[PDB]
């Protein structure tokens, strides 16, 4: 299942992220990709020879913007570094 934050377990590793169709060209023998700082970035599906990019699914900080309780109790919430769809 693609384009969803899922709990994936490919051949030898596991993780949570968003599996998308990639534009990378893996070598016929290579199996796993990596980012610069030793981070899983792409995986070849053991069944279809497709290259899938792994994007970690949305998360961020939640900050409460409130006036002082001596003034009001109505608040406003800031979902850091996400778009207004996944919330």
């Amino acid at each position: 299942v693609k384009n969803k934050c899922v709990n994936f377990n490919f051949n030898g590793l596991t993780g949570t992220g968003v599996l998308t169709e990639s534009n990378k060209k893996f070598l016929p023998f290579q199996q796993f990709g990596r980012d610069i700082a030793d981070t899983t970035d792409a995986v070849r599906d053991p069944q279809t020879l497709e290259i899938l990019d792994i994007t970690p699914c949305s998360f961020g900080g939640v900050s409460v913007i409130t006036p002082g309780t001596n003034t009001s109790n109505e608040v406003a919430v800031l979902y850091q570094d996400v778009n207004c769809t996944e919330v």
Binding site: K24, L27, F29, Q31, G33, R34
Partner: peptide, 23 residues
Amino acid sequence: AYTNSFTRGVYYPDKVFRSSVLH
């Protein structure tokens, strides 16, 4: 009979793809 193996003998250490990186 001896020769200079200039720079040869380098094989991929693993099955891990990497890109534009010095590993």
